[PDB]
Amino acid sequence: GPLGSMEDFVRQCFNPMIVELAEKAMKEYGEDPKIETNKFAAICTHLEVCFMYSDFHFIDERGESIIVESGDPNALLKHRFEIIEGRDRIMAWTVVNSICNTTGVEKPKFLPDLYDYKENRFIEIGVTRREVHIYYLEKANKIKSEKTHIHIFSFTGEEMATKADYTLDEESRARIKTRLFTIRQEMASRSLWDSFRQSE
Length: 200
Ligand SMILES: [Ca+2]
Ligand SMILES: [Ca+2]
Hints:
This protein has helices spanning about 5-15, 15-30, 35-55, 90-105, 130-140, 170-190, 195-200; strands at about 55-60, 65, 80, 80-85, 115, 120-130, 150-155, 160. The relative contact order is 0.14. It is an alpha+beta fold. One calcium ion binds next to loops. It is classed as rna binding protein. The entry lists the keywords cap-snatching, RNA binding protein.
């Protein structure tokens, strides 16, 4: 087949808010989305996963955890997750600080991806083109000390999470894995996949 551009794939296959947030994140760290293109696509993917992880999950009027797929939820419902990723550094730490003072949870040394109000913990999400156990160990060894929960997804459907605790129901994680499969398949049809996989 013909080789497509990863730029084209990213703008066609991710929603514009994700793409924009990804561009902003790369600029913030001095990376150009038009050169580190595989990285661009990885950052978009990771962002989307963070959003999909939190999608639909609320804490009900009584304070337990429920799933609603409407577009208009009950306005007394609280979002189960805070989303830290996608925010610029100042706002990300502002949110982390607010969570920590309120819930009294310990302050992390690096910005995590999410906060889970049900489980009362920060979450580090990862999406890897390699084996989940290796990526898992890399992440665990970076965070130094841990209350932060780690949840790793791969493009082939494997997961690994701290203490074999996967946080979400199978259906939610299936949505995410289905999306990752679709990303991989679409990259493959544009002949972008083998390279994307090898660049991590
Ligand atoms: Ca980030
Ligand atoms: Ca992050």
